[PDB]
Every structure is written in C-alpha cells, then in structure tokens.
Design an enzyme around this catalytic site. Sequence first.
Site, PDB file in Angstrom:
ATOM      1  N   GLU A  35      29.463  34.542  38.270  1.00 43.67           N
ATOM      2  CA  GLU A  35      29.837  35.432  39.381  1.00 43.67           C
ATOM      3  C   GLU A  35      29.425  34.949  40.775  1.00 43.67           C
ATOM      4  O   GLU A  35      30.210  35.000  41.736  1.00 43.67           O
ATOM      5  CB  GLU A  35      29.377  36.874  39.176  1.00 43.67           C
ATOM      6  CG  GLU A  35      30.119  37.653  38.065  1.00 43.67           C
ATOM      7  CD  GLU A  35      31.472  38.176  38.503  1.00 43.67           C
ATOM      8  OE1 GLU A  35      31.987  37.889  39.572  1.00 43.67           O
ATOM      9  OE2 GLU A  35      31.982  38.916  37.643  1.00 43.67           O
ATOM     10  N   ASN A  46      38.133  40.972  48.705  1.00 44.07           N
ATOM     11  CA  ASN A  46      39.406  41.032  47.942  1.00 44.07           C
ATOM     12  C   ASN A  46      40.460  41.543  48.956  1.00 44.07           C
ATOM     13  O   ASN A  46      40.563  42.751  49.145  1.00 44.07           O
ATOM     14  CB  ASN A  46      39.308  41.906  46.693  1.00 44.07           C
ATOM     15  CG  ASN A  46      38.128  41.512  45.804  1.00 44.07           C
ATOM     16  OD1 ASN A  46      38.233  40.398  45.247  1.00 44.07           O
ATOM     17  ND2 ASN A  46      37.065  42.291  45.707  1.00 44.07           N
ATOM     18  N   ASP A  49      42.969  44.387  47.807  1.00 39.80           N
ATOM     19  CA  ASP A  49      42.687  45.830  47.689  1.00 39.80           C
ATOM     20  C   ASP A  49      41.672  46.340  48.717  1.00 39.80           C
ATOM     21  O   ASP A  49      41.371  47.561  48.660  1.00 39.80           O
ATOM     22  CB  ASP A  49      42.434  46.251  46.251  1.00 39.80           C
ATOM     23  CG  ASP A  49      40.982  46.058  45.852  1.00 39.80           C
ATOM     24  OD1 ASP A  49      40.350  45.196  46.465  1.00 39.80           O
ATOM     25  OD2 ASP A  49      40.475  46.866  45.035  1.00 39.80           O
ATOM     26  N   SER A  51      38.571  45.802  48.989  1.00 42.27           N
ATOM     27  CA  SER A  51      37.183  46.040  48.469  1.00 42.27           C
ATOM     28  C   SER A  51      36.428  44.721  48.614  1.00 42.27           C
ATOM     29  O   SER A  51      37.029  43.644  48.841  1.00 42.27           O
ATOM     30  CB  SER A  51      37.320  46.494  47.018  1.00 42.27           C
ATOM     31  OG  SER A  51      37.668  45.451  46.121  1.00 42.27           O
ATOM     32  N   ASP A  53      32.975  42.385  46.839  1.00 47.99           N
ATOM     33  CA  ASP A  53      32.037  42.158  45.720  1.00 47.99           C
ATOM     34  C   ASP A  53      30.742  41.611  46.335  1.00 47.99           C
ATOM     35  O   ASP A  53      30.857  40.693  47.128  1.00 47.99           O
ATOM     36  CB  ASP A  53      32.600  41.224  44.665  1.00 47.99           C
ATOM     37  CG  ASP A  53      33.924  41.726  44.089  1.00 47.99           C
ATOM     38  OD1 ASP A  53      34.052  42.894  43.803  1.00 47.99           O
ATOM     39  OD2 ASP A  53      34.733  40.811  43.959  1.00 47.99           O
ATOM     40  N   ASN A  60      31.369  45.626  42.765  1.00 51.26           N
ATOM     41  CA  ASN A  60      32.457  46.020  43.719  1.00 51.26           C
ATOM     42  C   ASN A  60      32.215  47.284  44.483  1.00 51.26           C
ATOM     43  O   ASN A  60      31.661  48.283  43.973  1.00 51.26           O
ATOM     44  CB  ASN A  60      33.763  45.991  42.896  1.00 51.26           C
ATOM     45  CG  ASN A  60      35.030  46.204  43.738  1.00 51.26           C
ATOM     46  OD1 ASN A  60      35.519  47.325  43.888  1.00 51.26           O
ATOM     47  ND2 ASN A  60      35.524  45.106  44.284  1.00 51.26           N
TER      48      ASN A  60
END
Length: 130
Positions: A35, A46, A49, A51, A53, A60
Amino acid sequence: KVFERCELARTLKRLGMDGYRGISLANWMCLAKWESGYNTRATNYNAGDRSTDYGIFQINSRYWCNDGKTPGAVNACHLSCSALLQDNIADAVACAKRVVRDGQGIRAWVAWRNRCQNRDVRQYVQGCGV
C-alpha cells in the site's frame, strides 16, 4: 517516516495486530508493503471519486477518516485524516482494526487480494523476532 521491515513488525505486534480478527501479522506486513512501502506520509488522491488514501495502510477518506473535502464522506474511525499521517502509527492501527471489523475483513483492501492472498507471506516477518 519510512519503517524498516522488522521494526514495523515488532511495532505491529505490540499494538495487538497479530491474529486480530483472524489476520496474521505477515498479512498486515504484506498489506503495508504494497500500500505505502511502509511510509506513514504516503497519500494517494483518487481523481475519479475525489477521495484520498492516507498513511501506511492507505485508509480512504470516503468512509474512514475526515479530510473535509470528500463528498458524501463518513468518518467511521472518528479521526481527522491528518491522524493517519503521523510517525506514531497508533491511530492508523486503531483505524485499520475498525476497517476489518466489517464483513469483508482484510479483503477490504484490493491490494491485499492482488498481492497477498493465497501467496506465501512468511518472508514479510522472517527474522524479525515476532
């Protein structure tokens, strides 16, 4: 901070992650490795969308933490997304535990399915003393 493999493994074991909701330590190591490369300051926006991370487990912002700029967001961990960018991973671990307590478990992270599931994950904890 960028953790060294064994240092993080020992940190996770002290935080109670070994076998948490049936998840072995090597699985958590595998997840952190793919990750963020064990980097607590990693962030991924992202574009698709709106959002983002955050942190070592790339948690998220739509569901778990509040960053104020994600539409339709819930803050299931009841934390500012800033909390997930600290050198001390206690907050991120308590949030990760919350994620898995959801009828998905470790599979909640698609990276885990891609890179860890059904694979030999022993290498991640080998020689660490955990």
